[PDB]
C-alpha cells in the first residue's frame, strides 16, 4: 500500500485514466455516419465530393473500412465506408450501432443494368434488397437513413432512351425524369417499416460542391434535434 512501487502504479493508472477520459470526450464531439450502397453506386463519388476542401480535420493500406474525417459548419463528421468488407454483414454490422445516420448511396442509372452474378437480377433490386436489410436491422431501429440517389443525368438519359417498365413491371406512367425519380424515391421510402421511430432523408445528388454536404449537415442536425425532443418527450 504505502510502498513506492504501489504509489507509482496507482499514479500511472490515474494518468492513463485521465488520458482515456480526455480522448473519450474528444471523440464524443464526432458525428459518426455509416456509408453504404452497392459497388458502383456512387459511394466513391459522394466521398470525393465531400473531401474537396475539408478533409482530415509507415502505415499499411487496408482495403477494409475506410475512415473519412471532415468538418462542416463547426461539426466534425466521421464517415465509415465499409466497401472492402466482402463477408457476412451480420457478423460486424452491430459494431456500427450508435451512428448518427446511415448514408445509403444508390445509383439511379443501374435500373436497366444487371448484376454480373446472374442475368435475371437487377442491380436496382439488389440495392432495394440491401436497403431493406439495413433499414430494418435490430441494431438500426432508431438510426435514420440519408438516401443519396446518384447519377441523375445518366438516369435521365436512360429513361429517355430505355423505359422504366423493365425494372418495375407494375409501373405505369410517362417516361420523364420527375415521375420516374419520384417513383424510385417512394419505392425506397416504402421499404421503411419503422416509420414512427426513424426517418429517411432523400437527396438527388447534384454537381454543386456544397449542396450534398449541406444536405447531410441538415439531416444530421435534424436527427440531433429530434433525438433531443424525444429525450424531453416533445417528439
Amino acid at each position: 500500500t504505502l510502498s513506492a512501487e504501489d504509489k507509482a502504479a496507482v499514479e500511472r493508472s490515474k494518468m492513463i485514466d485521465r488520458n482515456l477520459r480526455e480522448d473519450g470526450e474528444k471523440a464524443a464531439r464526432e458525428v459518426k455516419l455509416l456509408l453504404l450502397g452497392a459497388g458502383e453506386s456512387g459511394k466513391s463519388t459522394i466521398v470525393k465530393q465531400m473531401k474537396i476542401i475539408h478533409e482530415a480535420g509507415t502505415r499499411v493500406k487496408t482495403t477494409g473500412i475506410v475512415e473519412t474525417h471532415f468538418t462542416f459548419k463547426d461539426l466534425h463528421f466521421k464517415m465509415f465506408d465499409v466497401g472492402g468488407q466482402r463477408s457476412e454483414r451480420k457478423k460486424w454490422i452491430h459494431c456500427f450501432e450508435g451512428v448518427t445516420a446511415i448514408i445509403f448511396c444508390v445509383a439511379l442509372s443501374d435500373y436497366d443494368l444487371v448484376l454480373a452474378e446472374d442475368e435475371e437480377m437487377n442491380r436496382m433490386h439488389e440495392s432495394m434488397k440491401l436497403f431493406d436489410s439495413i433499414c430494418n436491422n435490430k441494431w438500426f431501429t432508431d438510426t435514420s437513413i440519408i438516401l443519396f440517389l446518384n447519377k441523375k443525368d445518366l438516369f435521365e438519359e436512360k429513361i429517355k432512351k430505355s423505359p422504366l417498365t423493365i425494372c418495375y413491371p407494375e409501373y405505369a406512367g410517362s417516361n420523364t425524369y420527375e415521375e420516374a425519380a419520384a417513383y424510385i424515391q417512394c419505392q425506397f421510402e416504402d421499404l421503411n417499416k419503422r416509420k414512427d421511430t426513424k426517418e429517411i432523408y432523400t437527396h438527388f445528388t447534384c454537381a454543386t460542391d456544397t449542396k450534398n454536404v449541406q444536405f447531410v449537415f441538415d439531416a444530421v442536425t435534424d436527427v440531433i434535434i429530434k433525438n433531443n425532443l424525444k429525450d424531453c418527450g416533445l417528439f
Binding site: 459548419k73 463547426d74 461539426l75 440531433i224 425532443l229 429525450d231 416533445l234 417528439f235
Partner: protein
C-alpha cells in the same frame, strides 16, 4: 383532528423523501444516467431532498402545533432554509428548461460544447440565487414584527424585501421559464410539421400525435409549476402590501403553502419518473 393532519403531512414528507432519494440513488449508481440533463435532474432531486428533510419536518410541526415551539434562532434558521431550498428548486426548474432550450435549438452547441461543467455552473448559479434571496433578511432588511410574536415564524414582511424575494424567486423564474418553453414549443412544432395517399394519411396521423404529445408535455410541466407556486407567490406578494382589510383565512393559507411544498414531491414525478431511461434504470435496480 390533529392526528389526521399529522399523518397526512407525514405521508407527504415520506413520499417526497423516498422519491427524491430514489432518483438521486438511481442517477448515482447507474452509468447510463450520467449526462448533463440527468445531472441537472439529479441536482433538482438533491435540492428537493434538502427541502423534504430540512424544512418539511419543521413546517409540518408548525402546522400541527399551530405555533412555533423551537425558538427564535431556530425560527430564523427554518425561514432561511425554506427560502434558500425553495428558490434553489425553482431555479433548478429554470436551469432544466434552459438546458432543454439549448439542446433543441443549438445542436452544434449540444454536440461540440455541452459539458458537465455547464451543469455544475448552472447548479451553482441556482444555489447562489437561493443564497442571495435567503440571506439578506437575516443580515438586515427585516422588521421587528417577525420577533413581535414569539409563537409565530413568519417571514420578513418588509415591502422592499417582499418585492425583491418574490421577483427573484418566482416571477422572474416564471417569466424566463415560460419564454424558454414557448420557444421550445415553437421549435418542436416546426420540426413536427416539417399507396402514396395511405403514406400521407399515416404521416398526418403521426404529426397530429406528436403535436398532442408536445402539448401534453408542456402542459404537465408549466401547469404543475404554476398550480404549485403561483397561488403561494401571489399571496406572498399581495399580503405584505395589504396589511388591513385583506385577512388571510388560515385553512386557505395552509393549503396555499403546502401546494408550494408539494412541488418537491411532484418534481421527480415529472422530470424523473416519466422518461424511459429512468424507468429502465429503476427496473434494473429493482
Amino acid at each position: 383532528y390533529q392526528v389526521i393532519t399529522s399523518l397526512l403531512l407525514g405521508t407527504l414528507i415520506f413520499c417526497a423523501v423516498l422519491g427524491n432519494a430514489c432518483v438521486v440513488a438511481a442517477i448515482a449508481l447507474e452509468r447510463s444516467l450520467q449526462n448533463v440533463a440527468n445531472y441537472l435532474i439529479g441536482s433538482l432531486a438533491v435540492t428537493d431532498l434538502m427541502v423534504s428533510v430540512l424544512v418539511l419536518p419543521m413546517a409540518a410541526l408548525y402546522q400541527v402545533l399551530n405555533k412555533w415551539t423551537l425558538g427564535q434562532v431556530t425560527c430564523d434558521l427554518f425561514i432561511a432554509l425554506d427560502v434558500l431550498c425553495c428558490t434553489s428548486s425553482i431555479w433548478h426548474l429554470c436551469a432544466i428548461a434552459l438546458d432543454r432550450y439549448w439542446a433543441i435549438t443549438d445542436p452544434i452547441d449540444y454536440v461540440n460544447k455541452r459539458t458537465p461543467r455547464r451543469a455544475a455552473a448552472l447548479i451553482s448559479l441556482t444555489w447562489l440565487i437561493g443564497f442571495l434571496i435567503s440571506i439578506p433578511p437575516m443580515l438586515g432588511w427585516r422588521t421587528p414584527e417577525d420577533r413581535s410574536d414569539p409563537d409565530a415564524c413568519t417571514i420578513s414582511k418588509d415591502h422592499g424585501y417582499t418585492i425583491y424575494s418574490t421577483f427573484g424567486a418566482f416571477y422572474i423564474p416564471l417569466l424566463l421559464m415560460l419564454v424558454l418553453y414557448g420557444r421550445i414549443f415553437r421549435a418542436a412544432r416546426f420540426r413536427i410539421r416539417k399507396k402514396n395517399e395511405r403514406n400521407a394519411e399515416a404521416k398526418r396521423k403521426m404529426a397530429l400525435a406528436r403535436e398532442r404529445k408536445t402539448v401534453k408535455t408542456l402542459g404537465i410541466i408549466m401547469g404543475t409549476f404554476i398550480l404549485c407556486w403561483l397561488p403561494f407567490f401571489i399571496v406572498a406578494l399581495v399580503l405584505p402590501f395589504c396589511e388591513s382589510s385583506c385577512h388571510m383565512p388560515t385553512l386557505l393559507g395552509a393549503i396555499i403553502n403546502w401546494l408550494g411544498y408539494s412541488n418537491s414531491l411532484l418534481n421527480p414525478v415529472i422530470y424523473a419518473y416519466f422518461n424511459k431511461d429512468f424507468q429502465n434504470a429503476f427496473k434494473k435496480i429493482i
